Amino acid sequence: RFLKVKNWETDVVLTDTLHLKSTLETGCTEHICMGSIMLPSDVRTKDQLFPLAKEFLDQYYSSIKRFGSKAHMDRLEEVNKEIESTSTYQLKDTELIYGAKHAWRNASRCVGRIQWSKLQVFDARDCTTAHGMFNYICNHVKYATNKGNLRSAITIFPQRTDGKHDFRVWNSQLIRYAGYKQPDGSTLGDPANVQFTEICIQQGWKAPRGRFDVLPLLLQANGNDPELFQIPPELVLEVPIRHPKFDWFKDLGLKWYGLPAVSNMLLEIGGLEFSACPFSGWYMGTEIGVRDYCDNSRYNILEEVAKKMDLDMRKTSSLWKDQALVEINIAVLYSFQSDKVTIVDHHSATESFIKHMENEYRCRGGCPADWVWIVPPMSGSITPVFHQEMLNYRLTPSFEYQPDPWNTHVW
Amino acid sequence: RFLKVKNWETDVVLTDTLHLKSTLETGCTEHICMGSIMLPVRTKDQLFPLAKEFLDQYYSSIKRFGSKAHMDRLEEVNKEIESTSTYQLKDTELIYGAKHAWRNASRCVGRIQWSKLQVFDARDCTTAHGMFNYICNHVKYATNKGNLRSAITIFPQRTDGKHDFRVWNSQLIRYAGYKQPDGSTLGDPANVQFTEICIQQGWKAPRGRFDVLPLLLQANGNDPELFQIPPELVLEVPIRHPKFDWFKDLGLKWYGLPAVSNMLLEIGGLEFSACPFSGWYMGTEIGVRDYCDNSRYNILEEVAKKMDLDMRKTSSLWKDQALVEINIAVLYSFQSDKVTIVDHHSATESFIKHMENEYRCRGGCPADWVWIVPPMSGSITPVFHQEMLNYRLTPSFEYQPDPWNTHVWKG
Ligand code: HEM
Ligand code: HEM
Numbered sequence: 118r119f120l121k122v123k124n125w126e127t128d129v130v131l132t133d134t135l136h137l138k139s140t141l142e143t144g145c146t147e148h149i150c151m152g153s154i155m156l157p158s159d160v161r162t163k164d165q166l167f168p169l170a171k172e173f174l175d176q177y178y179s180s181i182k183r184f185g186s187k188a189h190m191d192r193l194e195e196v197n198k199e200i201e202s203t204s205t206y207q208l209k210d211t212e213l214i215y216g217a218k219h220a221w222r223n224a225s226r227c228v229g230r231i232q233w234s235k236l237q238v239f240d241a242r243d244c245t246t247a248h249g250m251f252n253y254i255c256n257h258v259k260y261a262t263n264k265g266n267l268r269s270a271i272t273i274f275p276q277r278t279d280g281k282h283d284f285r286v287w288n289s290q291l292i293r294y295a296g297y298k299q300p301d302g303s304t305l306g307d308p309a310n311v312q313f314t315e316i317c318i319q320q321g322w323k324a325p326r327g328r329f330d331v332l333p334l335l336l337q338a339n340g341n342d343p344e345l346f347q348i349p350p351e352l353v354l355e356v357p358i359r360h361p362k363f364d365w366f367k368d369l370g371l372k373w374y375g376l377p378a379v380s381n382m383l384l385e386i387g388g389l390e391f392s393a394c395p396f397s398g399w400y401m402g403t404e405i406g407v408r409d410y411c412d413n414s415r416y417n418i419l420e421e422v423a424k425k426m427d428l429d430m431r432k433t434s435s436l437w438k439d440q441a442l443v444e445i446n447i448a449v450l451y452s453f454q455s456d457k458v459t460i461v462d463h464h465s466a467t468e469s470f471i472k473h474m475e476n477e478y479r480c481r482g483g484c485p486a487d488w489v490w491i492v493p494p495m496s497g498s499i500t501p502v503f504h505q506e507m508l509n510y511r512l513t514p515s516f517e518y519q520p521d522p523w524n525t526h527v528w
Numbered sequence: 529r530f531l532k533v534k535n536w537e538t539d540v541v542l543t544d545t546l547h548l549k550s551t552l553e554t555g556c557t558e559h560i561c562m563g564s565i566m567l568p569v570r571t572k573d574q575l576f577p578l579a580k581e582f583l584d585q586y587y588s589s590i591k592r593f594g595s596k597a598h599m600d601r602l603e604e605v606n607k608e609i610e611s612t613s614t615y616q617l618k619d620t621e622l623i624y625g626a627k628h629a630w631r632n633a634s635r636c637v638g639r640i641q642w643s644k645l646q647v648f649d650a651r652d653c654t655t656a657h658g659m660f661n662y663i664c665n666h667v668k669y670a671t672n673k674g675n676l677r678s679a680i681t682i683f684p685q686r687t688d689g690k691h692d693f694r695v696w697n698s699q700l701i702r703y704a705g706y707k708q709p710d711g712s713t714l715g716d717p718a719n720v721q722f723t724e725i726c727i728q729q730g731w732k733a734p735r736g737r738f739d740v741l742p743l744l745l746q747a748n749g750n751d752p753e754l755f756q757i758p759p760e761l762v763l764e765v766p767i768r769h770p771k772f773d774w775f776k777d778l779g780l781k782w783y784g785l786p787a788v789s790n791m792l793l794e795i796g797g798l799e800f801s802a803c804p805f806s807g808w809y810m811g812t813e814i815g816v817r818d819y820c821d822n823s824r825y826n827i828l829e830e831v832a833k834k835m836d837l838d839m840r841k842t843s844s845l846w847k848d849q850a851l852v853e854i855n856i857a858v859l860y861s862f863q864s865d866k867v868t869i870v871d872h873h874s875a876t877e878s879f880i881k882h883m884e885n886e887y888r889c890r891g892g893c894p895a896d897w898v899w900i901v902p903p904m905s906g907s908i909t910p911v912f913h914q915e916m917l918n919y920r921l922t923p924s925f926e927y928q929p930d931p932w933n934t935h936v937w938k939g
């Protein structure tokens with residue numbers, strides 16, 4: 118029960134003991150593996166809250182090498198008394214920062230975690246209105262963008278109380294392009310965002326109806342109806358996409374935004390639930406060039422790119438999609454790099470992740486990792502993670518999925 | 529209890545009930561997923577329940593469940609077990625069992641073809657020379673002058689584990705690999721260890737880059753014996769590129785028939801330790817893995833050099849570019865020579881159609897996403913967005929230890 122993972126390219130074998138600290142459940146059983154299910158899985162009772170807080174404070178005080186000290190037992194008693202009375206408790210700033218960094222550290226689907234300890238945490242727990250949320254989010258965006266020298270950051274709004282007063286960012290990311298269904302057939306802009314784009318229109322947003330319309334923010338504070346806000350465009354850094362060899366590539370009129378800032382997840386620390394916690398890093402090139410541009414249910418530009426390359430598109434065995442897919446991803450990396458916007462290629466990120474895995478096995482005893490998500494969506498086997506066995510398990514603090522608010526919100 | 533899988537590109541949802549028929553264990557638990565782990569003597573006691581389960585499935589499939597033929601066969605097998613400690617499958621049962629071991633192989637993307645398997649019964653074989661003869665006839669039938677036909681040849685089942693039949697090769701046709709004194713490798717690095725065994729058994733190695741290995745065949749537990757497949761039975765394809773005239777000058781070639789020979793076939797508790805089977809190649813097996821795995825022929829750099837790519841930094845995607853071209857050349861060469869091959873786009877599309885058909889008529893289709901998704905261009909194939917459930921059904925193909933690690937040498 119001290120499990121081992123082998124890298125079949127290098128024969129390196131690592132021994133995992135961290136998984137024994139795992140608490141939550143994976144969804145698999147001994148009879149069925151759900152490793153390719155996207156999603157397995159209101160208020161917390163006074164009961165289950167205190168074990169969750171004790172577990173978290175136990176790991177916190179071990180990490181500052183004060184396990185079982187005066188401070189540890191005192192803090193444990195202090196939180197114990199607050200829960201007894203108020204039926205919740207508040208984290209100290211130090212514990213908030215530690216918990217946010219470790220929710221990233223524990224995100225088994227994230228290939229970017231070698232950076233987990235360089236996270237800028239913005240405490241927004243004093244926020245009360247959507248206007249205030251807009252202010253905090255503009256400041257996040259500006260800090261994280263840093264004129265193209267991107268910096269990781271998370272902004273943490275007040276924790277859930279009774280489930281009636283939730284803070285929520287209704288956007289799935291802070292910056293995403295609008296999507297419009299056409300009266301005849303296809304889709305203008307981003308198809309992934311068609312329902313959200315229509316919620317914003319069905320709310321007051323006067324859509325410019327272009328290909329790359331930056332969506333407004335739709336912010337919900339304290340359970341009230343959400344409110345529309347327009348991110349100042351000078352805060353939205355964008356990269357025109359061109360190709361270092363093909364001049365006609367500019368003429369496709371493509372761009373993308375520099376800042377990936379996921380805003381629909383829930384952050385759990387010591388049993389406390391932060392339903393609004395937008396966080397941001399920097400892109401891996403394939404996130405734009407493989408998924409955002411070439412998914413059939415997304416921008417789906419493979420057709421026209423291959424045409425402009427004059428490729429034989431009459432049979433799949435010409436690999437015309439594979440050829441186009443590569444050039445697109447060369448262009449994305451070339452454009453970001455030319456404009457001095459931070460970006461990492463999938464070869465560099467996966468190599469970093471293997472090094473991070475080694476570090477975590479050495480200093481922490483393990484690293485939970487979800488092969489299905491860690492391997493990039495192109496050129497999988499020529500990246501080092503393809504040949505790396507990984508163990509997937511759920512540690513806390515964590516980032517979790519949560520329902521879309523428009524399915525829940527009492528309007 | 530029913531389970532659902534979702535295709536996230538098409539929103540098609542399917543319902544799996546077949547997983548309830550699952551007997552064997554997956555390696556996962558409620559707290560850890562072993563989904564990316566490459567791999568996570570039987571007495572009369574445990575055998576009749578295995579036989580009875582198999583015969584129930586067999587007689588259900590021919591619509592005679594509970595018939596007098598069914599009950600008589602059950603009694604016949606029971607008496608044969610308690611009196612001889614094993615039993616013999618009928619020819620009909622052997623054919624059904626082999627086809628369903630393929631149908632159940634959750635890592636195989638080519639399973640739409642499962643019911644068109646040619647089964648050769650070699651259970652009357654007694655010597656290595658006889659094994660050589662059966663295998664020659666298999667290779668000839670399967671190759672069919674390039675119009676490849678799926679086939680399996682089944683040698684006698686295990687008795688006391690001291691009399692195993694084994695094919696010591698990992699595939700029937702594979703190229704030798706030679707470690708040089710200077711540390712370099714000539715030929716296929718994957719086959720260095722097996723090549724050394726062959727030479728130690730008296731094989732005279734040509735010491736070239738594409739030497740077909742000899743067959744090393746073990747009958748009835750005796751020491752294995754060397755045989756040379758007649759070269760006119762080994763169909764090979766010179767690899768050239770439809771636009772790069774210089775590609776032929778790399779001197780590459782590959783064999784047409786992929787024929788896995790180291791697995792164990794389990795049917796009704798019986799264990800067939802020598803059961804070589806063959807189909808036809810998916811292009812990426814050769815052009816991504818066999819040629820571009822760092823621990824294989826690893827020709828990426830020489831192709832990149834001859835394409836004059838920017839190899840200074842990885843973010844130029846020179847590796848991705850060279851990988852697509854190599855895979856174009858593999859498919860082009862096979863199609864030009866009329867040797868059956870399938871590209872990864874066609875094969876994954878067929879698999880989805882196969883999977884949906886299996887959900888309708890069978891109630892499920894066990895599938896291992898980690899293996900089904902191709903090793904390049906993953907997300908532009910339809911399996912990437914397909915949720916899959918993995919579980920173990922019997923009849924099955926299993927891994928088994930390499931024979932040189934367990935064989936007791938006669939001398
Ligand atoms: C700094 C550079 C980063 C890179 C290059 C990176 C890369 C990635 C990629 C490529 C994915 C796959 C997502 C997809 O395919 O849609 C992912 C998942 C994820 N990332 Fe990171 N990431 C970074 C930073 C961060 C940060 C700062 C956080 C939070 C503090 C974070 C949390 C996550 C989570 C929770 C997931 C999985 C979401 C889920 O379970 O669906 N990442 N990452
Ligand atoms: C007819 C065309 C076939 C195609 C295109 C095909 C394709 C594939 C591919 C690409 C893999 C993964 C290979 C790898 O990356 O190593 C695989 C796995 C597998 N195939 Fe098929 N296959 C075919 C026929 C067959 C047949 C005839 C059998 C047996 C009767 C079979 C049994 C298996 C098994 C057991 C695996 C799992 C291997 C493992 O667990 O290591 N396949 N197949």
Ligand SMILES: Nc1cccc(CNCCOc2cccc(OCc3ccc4ccc(N)nc4c3)c2)n1
Pocket residue numbers: 229377379397398399400401404536
């Ligand atoms: N639900 C739905 C609904 C319809 C279609 C789809 C498409 N199928 C999966 C969508 O994809 C996801 C899913 C979940 C999370 C996600 O984002 C995670 C993430 C987090 C942090 C990052 C930091 C930096 C960076 N560069 N990337 C990051 C990505 C994407 N999904």
Ligand SMILES: Nc1cccc(CNCCOc2cccc(OCc3ccc4ccc(N)nc4c3)c2)n1
Pocket residue numbers: 125786788806807808809810813
């Ligand atoms: N031990 C070692 C040692 C060092 C390095 C490696 C590298 N890791 C090799 C993985 O490679 C495999 C593994 C297992 C099976 C396999 O073949 C499966 C197969 C079966 C039937 C087919 C029928 C048709 C067809 N077209 N393909 C088939 C493929 C490859 N391994």
Ligand SMILES: C[C@H](O)[C@H](O)[C@H]1CNc2nc(N)[nH]c(=O)c2N1
Pocket residue numbers: 125503504505506507564565566898899900901
């Ligand atoms: C570590 C990992 O499980 C291993 O490299 C697997 C990944 N997926 C694969 N998929 C296929 N088709 N073939 C393989 O050999 C592998 N290898």
Ligand SMILES: C[C@H](O)[C@H](O)[C@H]1CNc2nc(N)[nH]c(=O)c2N1
Pocket residue numbers: 153154155489490491536912913914915916
């Ligand atoms: C069906 C499958 O679970 C789904 O498509 C997953 C597969 N792997 C992925 N991997 C990453 N990085 N991102 C994704 O959205 C997905 N989607």
Ligand SMILES: [Zn+2]
Pocket residue numbers: 145149150151152556560561562563
């Ligand atoms: Zn699992």
